[PDB]
Amino acid sequence: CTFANLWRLLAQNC
Amino acid sequence: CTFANLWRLLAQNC
Amino acid sequence: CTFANLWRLLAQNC
Amino acid sequence: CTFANLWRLLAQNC
């Protein structure tokens, strides 16, 4: 549950 | 690319 | 400023 | 449950 994982998902989906 | 989707994908770990 | 905190704050809506 | 609210909370907390 990290900012890193948020950025990863934003990069993958947006 | 919706926040609801990302929030749900992050739910397991958060 | 932690993603865990933001995810929890957004649980109210998501 | 929106990107807009995520950004608001990021601005407030980070």
Residue numbers in the entry:
A (entry chain A), B (entry chain B), C (entry chain C), D (entry chain D): 1 to 14
Publication text:
Recently, Victorio and Sawyer reported the surprising, spontaneous formation of disulfide-linked dimers from a p53-derived bisthiol peptide called CV1 (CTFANLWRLLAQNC) using a mild aqueous buffer and dimethyl sulfoxide (DMSO) as oxidant. This peptide is derived from SAH-p53–8, a stapled variant of the N-terminal segment of the p53 protein that interacts with the proteins Mdm2 and MdmX. In initial studies, dimers of the CV1 peptide were determined to be exclusively antiparallel with no detectable formation of competing parallel dimers or intramolecular disulfide species. Dimerization was dependent on α-helical folding of CV1, yielding highly α-helical dimers.
The asymmetric unit is composed of two interacting dimers. In contrast to the previously proposed dimer interface involving tryptophan residues, the structure of each dimer in the crystal structure reveals a canonical knobs-into-holes packing between Leu6, Leu9, and Leu10 as expected for a dimer of α-helices. Cysteine residues extend beyond the helical segment of each peptide to form bridging disulfide bonds. For each dimer, one of the Phe3 residues and both Trp7 residues are oriented away from the dimer interface, suggesting a limited role for these residues in dimerization/disulfide bond formation. While not contributing to individual dimers, the Phe3 and Trp7 residues appear to stabilize a dimer of dimers in the asymmetric unit and help to rationalize several observations from previous and current CD data. The Trp7 residues form two types of interactions: the Trp7 residues from chains B and C form a parallel displaced stacking arrangement at a distance of approximately 3.2 Å (left) while the Trp7 residues from chains A and D are parallel to each other but interacting with other hydrophobic core residues instead of each other (right).
